[PDB]
Amino acid sequence: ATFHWDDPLLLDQQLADDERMVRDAAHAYAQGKLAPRVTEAFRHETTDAAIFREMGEIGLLGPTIPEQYGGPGLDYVSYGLIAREVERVDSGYRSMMSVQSSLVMVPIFEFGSDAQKEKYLPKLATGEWIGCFGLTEPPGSMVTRARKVPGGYSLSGSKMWITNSPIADVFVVWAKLDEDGRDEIRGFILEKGCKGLSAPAIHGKVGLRASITGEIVLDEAFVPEENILPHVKGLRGPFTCLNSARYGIAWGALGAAESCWHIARQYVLDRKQFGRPLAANQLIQKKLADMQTEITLGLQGVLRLGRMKDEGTAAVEITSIMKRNSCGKALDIARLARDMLGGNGISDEFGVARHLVNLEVVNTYHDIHALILGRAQTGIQAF
Ligand SMILES: CN1CCN(C)c2cc(CN)ccc21
């Protein structure tokens, strides 16, 4: 009976009560604690490690990790809802969280020994320990290498653009290990302090400036026998992690899109031209209709995918659909909002220009998703 412009399909009514509470709690935290930081943190590339303990203590880290290991044992829909509330403020904040959850806690939980899971998960869940994921190098063609030696492994190689690394306590590092007749990617857990490991910070970034990033440099770093992930070998290792992170990013990007939309709408409401508000312009109306439309549909898409993952009916290709669409439409929206603004950086509306440069990086983390889908439709590979 009543129209809700900000939620046309009443996504709010499609959610379970525990999901709603999880969403409202993430919203209260993001707006209450991340929003006051973000303008200055982005402008100056401020490092604030204290954020992990804030997130971990309300159960924002590793949302799907079971209570046995300190997680809040929430479903995929809750995870997406959290990502969306945090990225509503800033993608850099979302990125801290998605690394901790999908790139660190997930491989340890899924592939780790009982011993690894009890040691690492509870502190990753509270944010007492900060994690990072060492995959990218400066996948099938990585060069970081583990050598078998008395008592474990010796690692040499370099990882680049590693979110959290200069503040990380725990490092999940992927490296080739040839043993028996097979050279295969394996995962190793390293700890801050380990000899032959350093994590210099990278500064002067264009986007994601509110998030600290660095390298992982390994110079014959020794890893105890019980720090190798026993239950995974090859591409499946990192792929399981990225698939999980992509799902969170599919939701997150829509939160940033909604911020640029709301800023755009408020701006045209406040501004007048030719004696009428800008909101009276026909073309402005079309842009606002487009923004509303793509966000509204994108949300139905990620909600449905979440529901499918929770019931185990979701193939991995569906994540490619939603990841590509959320990131691509969020970027279009950020650009459409940007091109509506006539100023140059002083006013509140230039919050849009921050989301924009953030989404420009996120979108580049090749169009491989279109190729995954193309192969799934045709049976023919073009990658
Ligand atoms: C002419 N014009 C219009 C508005 N605008 C943002 C701008 C900004 C600069 C340099 N920041 C120079 C010219 C203009």
Asked whether the beta carbons of 192 and 169 are under 8 A apart, the reply is: yes
List the structure tokens of 37.
């930081």
CATH number of residue 154's parent domain: 2.40.110.10
Based on the fold, state whether residues 212 and 317 are members of the same structural domain: no
Say how many C-beta atoms besides its own lie within 10 A of residue 6's C-beta: 13
Ligand 1 mean position, distance from CA 281 (Å): 23
Ligand 1: residue of 273, 338, 344 to mutate (most ligand atoms within 8 A of CB) is 344
Cα-based distances in Å from 141 to 145, 164, 174, 185, 234: 11, 24, 12, 10, 11
- Contact present, 171 and 165 (Cβ < 8 Å): yes
Residues 6+ apart with CB under 8 A from 267: 278, 340, 341, 349
213/202 Cα distance (integer angstroms): 6
User: 214-217 long-range contacts, Cβ below 8 Å, gap at least 24?
Assistant: 214/162, 214/165, 214/166, 215/138, 215/158, 215/159, 215/160, 215/162, 215/165, 216/132, 216/134, 216/158, 216/159, 216/162, 216/165, 216/171, 216/173, 217/158, 217/159
Query: Is the beta carbon of 378 within 6 A of some atom in ligand 1?
Result: no
Reference 355, options 247, 262, 244; nearest CA is 262
Closest ligand 1 atom to the C-alpha of 343?
Answer: 6
Cα 20 to chain centroid distance, Å, stands at 21
Please indicate whether residue 282, judged by its CB atom, sits closer than 6 Å to ligand 1. no
User: How remote is the CA of residue 91 from the centroid of ligand 1, in Å?
Assistant: 28
Same structural domain, 84 and 160: no
Give the residues after which the backbone of the chain is interrupted, taking a C-to-next-N distance over 2.5 angstroms as a break: 138, 365
- Quote the ligand 1 centre to 344 CA distance (angstroms): 7
Distance (Å, rounded) from C-alpha 291 to C-alpha 283? 13
* Residue 326 and residue 253 in contact, taking contact as beta carbons nearer than 8 Å: yes
Contact 122, 68 (CB under 8 A): no
User: Do both 12 and 43 map to the same domain?
Assistant: yes
Q: Are the C-beta atoms of 51 and 96 separated by less than 8 Å?
A: yes
**Rg of the chain taking only CA atoms, in angstroms:** 21
Resolution (angstroms) equals 2.0
Structural tokens at position 107:
């491989």
Cα(270) to centroid of ligand 1, in Å?
A: 20
3-state secondary structure the chain: CCCCCCCCCCHHHHCCHHHHHHHHHHHHHHHHHHHHHHHHHHHHCCCCCHHHHHHHHCCCCCCCCCHHHCCCCCCHHHHHHHHHHHHHHCHHHHHHHHHHHHHHHHHHHHHCCHHHHHHHHHHHHHCCCCEEEECCCCCCCCCCEEEEECCEEEEEEEEEEEECHHHCCEEEEEEEEEECCEEEEEEEEEECCCCCEECCEECCCCCCCCCCEEEEEEEEEEEEHHHECCCCCCCHHHHHHHHHHHHHHHHHHHHHHHHHHHHHHHHHHHCEECCEEHHHCHHHHHHHHHHHHHHHHHHHHHHHHHHHHHCCCCCHHHHHHHHHHHHHHHHHHHHHHHHHCCCCCCCHHHHHHHHHHHHHHHCCCCCHHHHHHHHHHHCCCCC
Q: 153 and 20 in one domain? A: no
Co-location of 250 and 359 in the same domain: yes
Scored b (16 or more CB within 10 A) or e, 301-316 reads bbbebbeebeeeebee
* Same domain? 272 vs 308: yes
Q: Give residue for tokens 């998030």.
A: 211
| CB-neighbour burial class of residue 234 (10 A; exposed 0-12, middle 13-18, buried 19+) | middle
- Candidates 2, 3, 5, 1; CA nearest to 266 is 5
143 and 21 share one domain: no
Query: Which residues, at least 6 apart from 233, have a Cβ–Cβ distance to it below 8 Å?
Result: 182, 184, 185, 186
Q: Do residues 352 and 222 share a domain?
A: no
Technique of determination:
X-ray
Ligand 1 within 6 A of CB of 343: yes
For the purposes of burial, counting CB atoms within 10 Å of the CB of 164, is it exposed (0-12), middle (13-18) or buried (19 or more)? Answer: buried
Question: Ligand 1 centre from 342 Cα, in Å?
Answer: 8
- Say how far apart CA 129 and CA 60 lie, in whole Å: 14
Boundary-marking domain end, from 93, 111, 130: 130
All residues at 6 or more sequence positions from 353 whose CB lies less than 8 Å from its CB, including other chains: 338, 341, 345
Beta bridge mates, 159:
216
Are 157 and 218 a contacting pair, CB within 8 Å? yes
Which atom from ligand 1 is nearest to the alpha carbon of 344? 6
- C-alpha distances in Å from residue 329, one per residue of 53, 295, 322: 32, 8, 10
* Shortest-distance Cα residue to atom 9 of ligand 1: 344
Query: How big is the CA angle at 63 (ends 203 and 29), to the nearest 5 degrees?
Result: 65
Q: What's 361's domain CATH number?
A: 1.20.140.10
Domain count of the chain? 3
How far lies 29's CA from each of 32, 57, 87, in Å? Answer: 5, 11, 12
Domain C-terminal end among 130, 157, 185: 130
CA separation for the pair 106, 131 (Å, rounded): 11
**Is 269 annotated among the ligand-binding residues?**
no
Q: Give the Å distance between the CA of 339 and the centre of ligand 1.
A: 13
User: Is the minimum distance from the CB of 344 to ligand 1 under 6 angstroms?
Assistant: yes
Domain match, 31 and 13 both: yes
Report the nearest-CA residue for atom 8 of ligand 1.
Answer: 344
CA terminus-to-terminus distance, the chain: 49
Residue 226 and residue 253 in one domain: no
CA of 341 to the centre of ligand 1 (A): 11
Domain boundary among 233, 259, 285: 233
Cα(343) to centroid(ligand 1), Å: 7
Bridge partner residues of 170 (DSSP):
131, 191
Asked if residue 104 and residue 29 are part of one domain, the reply reads yes
CA dist., res. 135 & res. 157, Å (int): 11
Contact 53, 101 (CB under 8 A): no
For residue 56, what is the domain's CATH number?
1.10.540.10
Identify the domain containing residue 161 by its residue range. Answer: 131-233
290 and 259 share one domain: yes
